[PDB]
Amino acid sequence: QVAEDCMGLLQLLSNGTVLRSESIDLITQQIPFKNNQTVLFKDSIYHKPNNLHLRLYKPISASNRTALPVVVFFHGGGFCFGSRSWPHFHNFCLTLASSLNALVVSPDYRLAPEHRLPAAFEDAEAVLTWLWDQAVSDGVNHWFEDGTDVDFDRVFVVGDSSGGNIAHQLAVRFGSGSIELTPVRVRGYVLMGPFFGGEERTNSENGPSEALLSLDLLDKFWRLSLPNGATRDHHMANPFGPTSPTLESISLEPMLVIVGGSQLLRDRAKEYAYKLKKMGGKRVDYIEFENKEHGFYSNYPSSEAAEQVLRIIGDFMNNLS
Amino acid sequence: QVAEDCMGLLQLLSNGTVLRSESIDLITQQIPFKNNQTVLFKDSIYHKPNNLHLRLYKPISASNRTALPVVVFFHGGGFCFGSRSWPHFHNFCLTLASSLNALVVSPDYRLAPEHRLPAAFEDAEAVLTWLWDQAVSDGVNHWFEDGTDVDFDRVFVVGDSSGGNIAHQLAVRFGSGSIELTPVRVRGYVLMGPFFGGEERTNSENGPSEALLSLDLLDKFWRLSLPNGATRDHHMANPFGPTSPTLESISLEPMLVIVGGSQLLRDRAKEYAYKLKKMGGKRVDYIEFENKEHGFYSNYPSSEAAEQVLRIIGDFMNNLS
């Protein structure tokens, strides 16, 4: 049955969508004199038994000027695909590093079906634990050949899709006081189109398919990701499911939920944000980019929307630091 | 066994690579005043029985000024993945359309393992046949709501990866006189990192893995794509295999082979080009972008290398038109 679902994933993934009507897009043209920055980067093992690696990024000109904040970036996929080394994600981290003038940490995590959830969440904690280990032992000076000054008091987690779900899980784990990693302080979370689930569909989930994503594909992701016998109302998928933490008692750090207007996951992301808003103590900003689909920030690197996301994440970081 | 190979494909695909040493990349920063263009586009069925669609792109400002040449773009994958609607490929076609001031045709084709090769090649011919049908019946005027002037005497095929292989197959089919579609004239072919194969490895194929591609992944592609019992020396994979056409008797239109210096497929692409060069009547240009891996033109849309590829394809089109 896993092999059946695997074959169906391939079919669904590359199936695409058909535009009912004409559409116009706006494309940026040649830029003769372009502005430049170098970004240094390297891979390191963070979990030796599972052979899990992360990539560290450093903006060179900015690193020599001040102590850098940390952005931990968790890639997307459906808990079933994606590597830090993939051009798509690597490119995004290059941008994050230079734009935010920050040290970026981009870990691999175990993917399903081989490693069903909560494998990724365990791995995400191992990344944060690895960072702690590096912070307290001055392993930072051996990250790159030259020196590197890092401010572990200014850490931020940026989550894309399934990485957005991972971000939420960390926030809860820290917020509840379950895990605690001084001198590492996560000051905020950025949930870019977080991968949340539910047995009951939202209106947007029943709406038209995106360029790549369909409701069937998302359902397939959950079938392969969640433990055998679980439903989409499981707390790992649905943060507001029947048996999920209350969250009204948990102290969460400030959160930024970014989503596209034409996303299937839009309604569920807005439900998420505004349920937290109405709860006391929670600072949650919700930003919706009109007429955009999943991954617009990374799928269209040089678009106006992507640039704006980077600016918003930057301001968010300034406000909290 | 197909289900076994499917599970192994997933693992191999998202496995990634580990950098042995530090690396630097150069990233372009914010562009305050950006130059713009609109591109109109639509989907059409070109093969009703298999429900195969293509996407037509039109640069608006350029279409009102002159008759547009045609670029038929065949997407990559490994004959196993990819849709015209995918952001990755859609973005590239937006660029092609505006940069080259051309009408772009981006078809889906049936993918393996469900449809093993030569399914894609049959579908590629159906696209060209569809274009012929449109040209001779003035169906072009009903492509978009407004008018569209197309020069079917100036058609070019741009192939990416597996699409590069498809391009080669069309070139042979036209060149030999097997198929002929007046008033449609394909004046040249662009083979961007064409997906060619061989039982025997090149030096580059034994070299280090790329960000995404590994030799194992490419081998898996062929196992799922080629008919059951075939080897990588089959003519559909290897154009210079033991039982492949001679090509010295076939009249090929001018060809442009573009490849990255750090690609696994580099050596085989260079063998391809220079074997044709040494044969009389063949005009083949070979361009190698140093220290680049597969898909650099599309994976890094706003990079210097990608811009250069677009310029080179443009000059190629001018020279032949």
Side-chain angles (χ1 to χ4, degrees):
Chain A
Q1 70 182 304
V2 176
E4 183 178 2
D5 289 309
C6 176
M7 285 297 318
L9 182 60
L10 264 58
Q11 291 180 0
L12 282 166
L13 181 69
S14 299
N15 198 98
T17 314
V18 175
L19 291 191
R20 293 289 187 243
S21 182
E22 290 182 6
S23 306
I24 304 188
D25 258 309
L26 196 67
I27 62 100
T28 296
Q29 261 313 106
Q30 293 177 335
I31 303 301
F33 285 80
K34 257 178 277 115
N35 279 41
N36 285 350
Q37 271 194 51
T38 53
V39 181
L40 186 65
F41 59 99
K42 181 178 83 70
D43 291 315
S44 292
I45 304 167
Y46 76 83
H47 198 261
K48 299 159 195 296
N50 292 128
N51 199 47
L52 293 171
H53 300 70
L54 51 78
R55 187 163 289 179
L56 302 167
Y57 300 75
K58 190 171 70 170
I60 294 181
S61 62
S63 61
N64 298 350
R65 298 295 194 289
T66 192
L68 303 177
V70 182
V71 172
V72 189
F73 175 73
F74 289 100
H75 71 79
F79 296 112
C80 301
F81 297 107
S83 182
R84 70 200 183 334
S85 67
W86 279 13
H88 176 65
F89 293 126
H90 177 65
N91 189 5
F92 190 67
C93 289
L94 289 180
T95 304
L96 284 177
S98 53
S99 185
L100 307 175
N101 297 122
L103 188 147
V104 179
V105 183
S106 188
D108 284 337
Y109 51 96
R110 271 154 331 132
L111 308 158
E114 184 180 16
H115 330 94
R116 274 174 184 307
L117 274 191
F121 306 138
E122 179 186 352
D123 295 352
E125 289 190 16
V127 169
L128 270 294
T129 294
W130 181 86
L131 277 179
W132 175 83
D133 209 300
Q134 298 297 306
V136 303
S137 68
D138 298 356
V140 166
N141 290 118
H142 305 67
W143 285 1
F144 303 106
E145 288 176 4
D146 75 305
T148 306
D149 195 356
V150 183
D151 188 358
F152 287 108
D153 199 61
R154 292 185 284 129
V155 179
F156 301 85
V157 178
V158 173
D160 163 51
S161 186
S162 57
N165 186 308
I166 291 170
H168 168 74
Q169 303 302 339
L170 291 177
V172 169
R173 287 279 291 170
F174 282 117
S176 61
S178 308
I179 62 173
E180 181 274 298
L181 298 178
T182 304
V184 184
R185 173 186 292 178
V186 180
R187 296 207 183 192
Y189 303 77
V190 174
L191 275 79
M192 269 160 346
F195 191 27
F196 297 133
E199 284 293 296
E200 189 177 298
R201 282 72 169 66
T202 66
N203 290 120
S204 65
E205 287 166 9
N206 295 315
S209 301
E210 309 176 17
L212 195 158
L213 294 192
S214 69
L215 189 67
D216 284 350
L217 184 64
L218 296 182
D219 288 351
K220 188 69 70 184
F221 283 152
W222 290 123
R223 183 162 188 67
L224 293 166
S225 297
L226 295 171
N228 212 247
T231 71
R232 295 194 293 283
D233 285 356
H234 198 290
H235 61 275
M236 278 168 346
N238 192 357
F240 297 108
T243 83
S244 310
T246 344
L247 259 56
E248 351 251 322
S249 41
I250 294 173
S251 293
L252 293 191
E253 304 307 307
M255 301 209 325
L256 181 68
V257 180
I258 303 167
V259 71
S262 297
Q263 281 196 242
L264 293 169
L265 288 169
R266 192 277 288 239
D267 289 354
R268 194 172 289 287
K270 194 171 181 183
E271 281 191 7
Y272 177 79
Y274 280 69
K275 281 191 208 289
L276 293 181
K277 279 184 175 292
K278 295 185 187 79
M279 283 156 33
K282 308 293 187 293
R283 190 195 178 240
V284 178
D285 302 301
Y286 174 78
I287 300 175
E288 188 178 310
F289 287 78
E290 301 180 61
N291 313 305
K292 297 303 179 178
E293 295 178 349
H294 192 72
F296 65 95
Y297 38 89
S298 56
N299 288 341
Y300 301 104
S302 62
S303 62
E304 177 62 18
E307 179 203 298
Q308 285 188 36
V309 171
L310 291 162
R311 174 64 191 295
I312 291 169
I313 295 172
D315 294 347
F316 180 73
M317 279 169 77
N318 293 357
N319 289 350
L320 297 182
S321 51
Chain B
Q1 70 182 304
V2 176
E4 183 178 2
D5 289 309
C6 176
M7 285 297 318
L9 182 60
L10 264 58
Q11 291 180 0
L12 282 166
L13 181 69
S14 299
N15 198 98
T17 314
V18 175
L19 291 191
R20 293 289 187 243
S21 182
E22 290 182 6
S23 306
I24 304 188
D25 258 309
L26 196 67
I27 62 100
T28 296
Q29 261 313 106
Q30 293 177 335
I31 303 301
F33 285 80
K34 257 178 277 115
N35 279 41
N36 285 350
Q37 271 194 51
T38 53
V39 181
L40 186 65
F41 59 99
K42 181 178 83 70
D43 291 315
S44 292
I45 304 167
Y46 76 83
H47 198 261
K48 299 159 195 296
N50 292 128
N51 199 47
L52 293 171
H53 300 70
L54 51 78
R55 187 163 289 179
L56 302 167
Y57 300 75
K58 190 171 70 170
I60 294 181
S61 62
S63 61
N64 298 350
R65 298 295 194 289
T66 192
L68 303 177
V70 182
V71 172
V72 189
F73 175 73
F74 289 100
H75 71 79
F79 296 112
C80 301
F81 297 107
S83 182
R84 70 200 183 334
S85 67
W86 279 13
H88 176 65
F89 293 126
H90 177 65
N91 189 5
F92 190 67
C93 289
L94 289 180
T95 304
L96 284 177
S98 53
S99 185
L100 307 175
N101 297 122
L103 188 147
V104 179
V105 183
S106 188
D108 284 337
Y109 51 96
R110 271 154 331 132
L111 308 158
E114 184 180 16
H115 330 94
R116 274 174 184 307
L117 274 191
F121 306 138
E122 179 186 352
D123 295 352
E125 289 190 16
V127 169
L128 270 294
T129 294
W130 181 86
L131 277 179
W132 175 83
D133 209 300
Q134 298 297 306
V136 303
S137 68
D138 298 356
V140 166
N141 290 118
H142 305 67
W143 285 1
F144 303 106
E145 288 176 4
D146 75 305
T148 306
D149 195 356
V150 183
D151 188 358
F152 287 108
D153 199 61
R154 292 185 284 129
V155 179
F156 301 85
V157 178
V158 173
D160 163 51
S161 186
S162 57
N165 186 308
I166 291 170
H168 168 74
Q169 303 302 339
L170 291 177
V172 169
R173 287 279 291 170
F174 282 117
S176 61
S178 308
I179 62 173
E180 181 274 298
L181 298 178
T182 304
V184 184
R185 173 186 292 178
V186 180
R187 296 207 183 192
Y189 303 77
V190 174
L191 275 79
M192 269 160 346
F195 191 27
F196 297 133
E199 284 293 296
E200 189 177 298
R201 282 72 169 66
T202 66
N203 290 120
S204 65
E205 287 166 9
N206 295 315
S209 301
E210 309 176 17
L212 195 158
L213 294 192
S214 69
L215 189 67
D216 284 350
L217 184 64
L218 296 182
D219 288 351
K220 188 69 70 184
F221 283 152
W222 290 123
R223 183 162 188 67
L224 293 166
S225 297
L226 295 171
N228 212 247
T231 71
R232 295 194 293 283
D233 285 356
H234 198 290
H235 61 275
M236 278 168 346
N238 192 357
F240 297 108
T243 83
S244 310
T246 344
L247 259 56
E248 351 251 322
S249 41
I250 294 173
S251 293
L252 293 191
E253 304 307 307
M255 301 209 325
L256 181 68
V257 180
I258 303 167
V259 71
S262 297
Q263 281 196 242
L264 293 169
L265 288 169
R266 192 277 288 239
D267 289 354
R268 194 172 289 287
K270 194 171 181 183
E271 281 191 7
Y272 177 79
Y274 280 69
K275 281 191 208 289
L276 293 181
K277 279 184 175 292
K278 295 185 187 79
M279 283 156 33
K282 308 293 187 293
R283 190 195 178 240
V284 178
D285 302 301
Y286 174 78
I287 300 175
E288 188 178 310
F289 287 78
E290 301 180 61
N291 313 305
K292 297 303 179 178
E293 295 178 349
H294 192 72
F296 65 95
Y297 38 89
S298 56
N299 288 341
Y300 301 104
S302 62
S303 62
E304 177 62 18
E307 179 203 298
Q308 285 188 36
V309 171
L310 291 162
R311 174 64 191 295
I312 291 169
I313 295 172
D315 294 347
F316 180 73
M317 279 169 77
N318 293 357
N319 289 350
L320 297 182
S321 51

